[PDB]
Amino acid sequence: FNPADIAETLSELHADERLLAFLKVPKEYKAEVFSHLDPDFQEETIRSIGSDEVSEILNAMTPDDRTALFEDFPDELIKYSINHLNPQERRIALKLLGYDSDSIARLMTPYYIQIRKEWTIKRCLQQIKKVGSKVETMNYLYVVDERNRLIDDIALGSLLLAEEDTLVSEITDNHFVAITTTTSKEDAVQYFEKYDRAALPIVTESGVLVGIVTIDDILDQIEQQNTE
Amino acid sequence: FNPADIAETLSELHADERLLAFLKVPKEYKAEVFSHLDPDFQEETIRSIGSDEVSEILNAMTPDDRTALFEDFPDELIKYSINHLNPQERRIALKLLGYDSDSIARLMTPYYIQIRKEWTIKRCLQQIKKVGSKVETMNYLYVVDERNRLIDDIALGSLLLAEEDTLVSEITDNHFVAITTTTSKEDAVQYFEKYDRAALPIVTESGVLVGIVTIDDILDQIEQQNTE
Ligand SMILES: [Mg+2]
Ligand SMILES: [Mg+2]
Ligand SMILES: [Mg+2]
Ligand SMILES: [Mg+2]
Ligand SMILES: [Mg+2]
Ligand SMILES: [Mg+2]
Ligand SMILES: [Mg+2]
Ligand SMILES: [Mg+2]
Ligand SMILES: [Mg+2]
Ligand SMILES: [Mg+2]
Numbered sequence: 001f002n003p004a005d006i007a008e009t010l011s012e013l014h015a016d017e018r019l020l021a022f023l024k025v026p027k028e029y030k031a032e033v034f035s036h037l038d039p040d041f042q043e044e045t046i047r048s049i050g051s052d053e054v055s056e057i058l059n060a061m062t063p064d065d066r067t068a069l070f071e072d073f074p075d076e077l078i079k080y081s082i083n084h085l086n087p088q089e090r091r092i093a094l095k096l097l098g099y100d101s102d103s104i105a106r107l108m109t110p111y112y113i114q115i116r117k118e119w120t121i122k123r124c125l126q127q128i129k130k131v132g133s134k135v136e137t138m139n140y141l142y143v144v145d146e147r148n149r150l151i152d153d154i155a156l157g158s159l160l161l162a163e164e165d166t167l168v169s170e171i172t173d174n175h176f177v178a179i180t181t182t183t184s185k186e187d188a189v190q191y192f193e194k195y196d197r198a199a200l201p202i203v204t205e206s207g208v209l210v211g212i213v214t215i216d217d218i219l220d221q222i223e224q225q226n227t228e
Numbered sequence: 229f230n231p232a233d234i235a236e237t238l239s240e241l242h243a244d245e246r247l248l249a250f251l252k253v254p255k256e257y258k259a260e261v262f263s264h265l266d267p268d269f270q271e272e273t274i275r276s277i278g279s280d281e282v283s284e285i286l287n288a289m290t291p292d293d294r295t296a297l298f299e300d301f302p303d304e305l306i307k308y309s310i311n312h313l314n315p316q317e318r319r320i321a322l323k324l325l326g327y328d329s330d331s332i333a334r335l336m337t338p339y340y341i342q343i344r345k346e347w348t349i350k351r352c353l354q355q356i357k358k359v360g361s362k363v364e365t366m367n368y369l370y371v372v373d374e375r376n377r378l379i380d381d382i383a384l385g386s387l388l389l390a391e392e393d394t395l396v397s398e399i400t401d402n403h404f405v406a407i408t409t410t411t412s413k414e415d416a417v418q419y420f421e422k423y424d425r426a427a428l429p430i431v432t433e434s435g436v437l438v439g440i441v442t443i444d445d446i447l448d449q450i451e452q453q454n455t456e
Contacts, residue, residue: 002403004422128388138385139367139426156384157366160356175230193451194232196444198367198426215443216424219450223421226454 007036031060039072054084064109067096104188105181108202108211111135122164150209178203192218235264259288267300282312292337295324332416333409336430336439339363350392368427378437406431420446
């Protein structure tokens with residue numbers, strides 16, 4: 001079944017049997033199912049399960065789902081959870097939590113596809129095969145220079161419409177939409193509304209690409225604002 | 229400049245000079261710029277410009293932007309506008325307007341990519357090149373049988389991760405999310421929120437694929453509901 005559907009069925013159970021049924025979920029989509037559950041039950045689960053299981057779930061969550069989870073935790077549980085993260089996930093999680101709580105960066109993930117201006121389209125397709133299964137989305141490719149700075153945002157389909165011998169520099173327009181880490185979540189919503197893109201890149205004040213935010217999470221932000 | 233940015237600059241002008249500046253827009257993205265302008269000015273423009281210009285703009289708009297425009301028009305202007313549409317666009321526009329005004333189908337577009345279970349991945353890529361520039365999005369591929377019925381929704385990146393000799397039938401799971409034309413716009417929003425997909429397909433009660441709805445238009449629906 002679809003992870004969102006599995007999560008809905010679990011959410012209908014009383015909490016006590018909900019934990020047993022969740023632990024029956026196969027491990028490949030256990031983290032994805034977990035990401036759809038209520039924050040109070042997510043906290044109960046993190047407090048209750050064994051350390052190895054905590055690490056499996058937390059290390060497999062997306063960085064932005066993990067940040068959203070940690071925002072609702074007491075500080076002590078945040079530290080416990082971070083102590084269960086592997087080195088790379090731990091560094092990512094602490095970087096994201098370092099941003100101001102109102103910043104758009106709190107919603108971002110660093111798992112995006114990076115391409116280079118000197119690459120052929122064929123080389124881009126090879127990179128896409130390399131990282132495609134681990135990234136948040138394959139549908140946007142971020143052209144970055146040697147200084148980590150964002151220079152273009154190329155749609156996946158545009159790459160497919162070009163010939164494989166073409167260089168990325170021949171299909172770039174050097175125009176793109178990006179949101180800075182200074183921008184609040186509320187203000188970032190209007191970028192998404194205006195530009196009608198399913199992901200937007202998040203850059204530092206000097207133009208360095210640090211993550212992407214996706215439209216599904218923006219919809220949650222809109223509903224949170226409108227209830228609050 | 230970006231069409232949304234051009235539209236914003238135009239929207240800042242007083243209406244009188246706004247029409248002249250808009251008619252200066254190059255024709256390739258004139259319709260896209262038009263789609264971002266206020267409905268009252270869109271109506272003034274349709275009433276004012278020549279028949280050839282009316283046809284160029286209206287025939288180049290997306291079917292769902294056109295339906296949204298027509299929903300705010302007096303009936304007489306709807307008829308005038310439809311009389312300016314080319315045969316294919318006219319049949320599409322009348323089909324969309326035939327649905328109940330509260331139906332999710334009012335938000336849909338028929339410009340999606342259709343693939344077949346018997347095709348190789350290579351053949352799918354050839355189809356994607358064929359239609360890619362005209363469709364609403366290249367990022368979702370709709371597997372349909374000989375009876376026009378929807379059987380799967382394949383992400384573009386998934387197609388890229390497979391080898392070109394593989395048949396579509398070897399990468400389908402026969403599980404998908406679809407919304408029926410019976411469903412209201414309000415109820416359709418929750419499908420988008422739950423399943424976190426940037427497009428969803430719209431099917432008839434017998435399972436025939438008739439269009440797709442995209443998340444950017446759903447965001448507009450959420451804001452319209454929340455103001456209303
Ligand atoms: Mg996310
Ligand atoms: Mg997610
Ligand atoms: Mg969330
Ligand atoms: Mg660009
Ligand atoms: Mg919009
Ligand atoms: Mg649309
Ligand atoms: Mg549009
Ligand atoms: Mg609209
Ligand atoms: Mg499927
Ligand atoms: Mg959601």
